[PDB]
Structure formats: C-alpha cells, structure tokens
Amino acid sequence: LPDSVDWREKGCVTEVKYQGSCGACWAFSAVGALEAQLKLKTGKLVSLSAQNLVDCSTEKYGNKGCNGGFMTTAFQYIIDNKGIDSDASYPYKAMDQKCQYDSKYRAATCSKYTELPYGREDVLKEAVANKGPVSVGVDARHPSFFLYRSGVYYEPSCTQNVNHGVLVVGYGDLNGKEYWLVKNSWGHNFGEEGYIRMARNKGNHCGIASFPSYPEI
Numbered sequence: 001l002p003d004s005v006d007w008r009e010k011g012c013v014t015e016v017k018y019q020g021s022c023g024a025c026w027a028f029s030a031v032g033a034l035e036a037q038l039k040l041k042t043g044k045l046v047s048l049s050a051q052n053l054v055d056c057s058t059e060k061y062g063n064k065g066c067n068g069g070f071m072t073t074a075f076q077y078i079i080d081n082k083g084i085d086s087d088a089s090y091p092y093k094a095m096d097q098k099c100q101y102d103s104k105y106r107a108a109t110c111s112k113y114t115e116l117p118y119g120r121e122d123v124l125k126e127a128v129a130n131k132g133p134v135s136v137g138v139d140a141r142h143p144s145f146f147l148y149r150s151g152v153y154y155e156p157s158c159t160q161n162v163n164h165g166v167l168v169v170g171y172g173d174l175n176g177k178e179y180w181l182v183k184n185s186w187g188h189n190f191g192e193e194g195y196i197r198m199a200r201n202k203g204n205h206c207g208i209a210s211f212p213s214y215p216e217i
C-alpha cells in the first residue's frame with residue numbers, strides 16, 4: 001500500500017461543514033463518505049444533504065436526528081430510499097425537520113455498504129487506499145480534542161468508547177508520527193481548517209478503527 005494517502009488531492013472531498021448545535025455528526029460522516037464515491041463514479045464533486053438524513057433516516061433506522069445516529073444505517077436508508085438529495089437542494093438547518101426528500105433533487109445513490117473488522121488499523125489503511133474515505137467513530141470527549149490546533153493528536157486519556165462520527169480521508173506520517181487524516185464537521189475553525197491528524201498504529205487510539213464503514217455506488 002502507498003505510505004501516504006490524501007483524498008483531497010484527488011478532488012474527492014467536499015468543503016468542511018459546520019453542524020452547529022445539532023448532533024448530526026453521523027449524517028455528515030455518511031454523506032462525506034458517499035461524496036467521494038460519487039466523485040469516483042461520475043467525476044463530479046457534489047456536497048450531499050446531511051439534513052436529508054437527519055429528517056428522513058429516523059426511527060426506522062435507529063437514528064435520532066440532532067440527538068445522534070449511525071453512519072451504517074444512514075447508508076441503508078439511502079439504499080432503501082433509492083437516493084439522497086444534494087446539499088444545495090435540501091440545505092442544512094441544524095434542527096430536526098419533517099422529511100422533505102424529493103427524487104427530483106437526487107444527487108447520489110447507494111447500492112451497499114461495508115463495515116470493517118473491529119480495531120484493525122491495517123485493514124482500515126487498505127480500505128482508505130483502495131476504496132476511498134471511510135466513516136468512523138472516535139472518542140472526542142476529551143478537552144484536548146476541542147483545543148487541537150496542529151501536529152499529530154495523541155491523548156493518553158482517550159478510550160475506545162467512541163461518541164463522535166467523522167471521516168478518514170487519508171493517512172501518512174508527520175515528523176515521525178504516523179497519523180490518520182480526519183475530516184470533522186465543526187467548521188473550518190476547528191483544528192487545521194476543519195481537519196485533525198490523529199495517531200495511527202498506536203493501539204486503535206481513541207477507537208478510530210473501532211467501527212469503520214464505507215458505501216459504494
């Protein structure tokens with residue numbers, strides 16, 4: 001596998017989003033993963049509707065909108081629904097709304113999704129290199145996470161109990177520290193313009209490889 005990968009270099013990563021006070025991290029993680037696949041299949045980079053997932057991938061999928069959800073069940077909703085609207089057509093309002101999906105605004109589809117084996121960072125590396133960005137959950141409860149500004153994030157107090165959904169868009173090494181390149185959804189003000197480099201091959205740090213999944217078209 002290549003020593004390093006950065007899907008932003010291949011134009012498969014949309015601009016960083018800001019979820020605000022709505023706990024839609026799972027929705028942003030899911031659309032982020034599908035956006036790359038859409039680019040790989042059609043050649044067009046298009047932001048997909050996280051709001052669409054918040055309002056429509058609800059109870060039947062075990063999700064709670066602005067109060068949390070799963071990336072995998074979001075993917076299944078897209079499969080079942082036979083589509084997902086573009087961000088431009090179904091904008092993000094950071095609130096729970098009635099489902100307003102309309103196929104006339106469909107910007108992507110999904111045929112299946114894959115969940116990687118638990119805590120296997122080399123399997124995650126392979127998927128990021130050969131498939132594309134991967135949705136993951138991390139333990140972002142620690143004060144140090146919110147204050148991350150640069151370098152490679154390593155927190156002694158991190159655990160494998162994940163609570164925040166994000167997107168792995170690459171990996172590599174900085175000044176001897178192997179890392180996973182993570183796209184967050186707390187706006188461009190967070191970390192390095194919306195991104196955070198998290199420790200890689202350090203015992204599944206912060207549970208980054210605990211529950212990885214990616215969609216396909």
Ligand SMILES: *[C@H](N)C1(NC(=O)[C@H](CS(=O)(=O)N2CCOCC2)N[C@@H](c2ccc(F)cc2)C(F)(F)F)CC1
Pocket residue numbers: 022023024025026062063064066067068069070071136137138162163164165166211
């Ligand atoms: C995001 N703003 C937020 N977290 C979540 O929604 C997480 C997503 S996760 O940590 O990536 N992960 C997905 C794979 O399973 C483990 C968790 N999910 C919540 C959640 C799930 C289902 C639900 F109905 C409500 C919340 C949790 F971490 F609790 F499992 C809201 C802060």
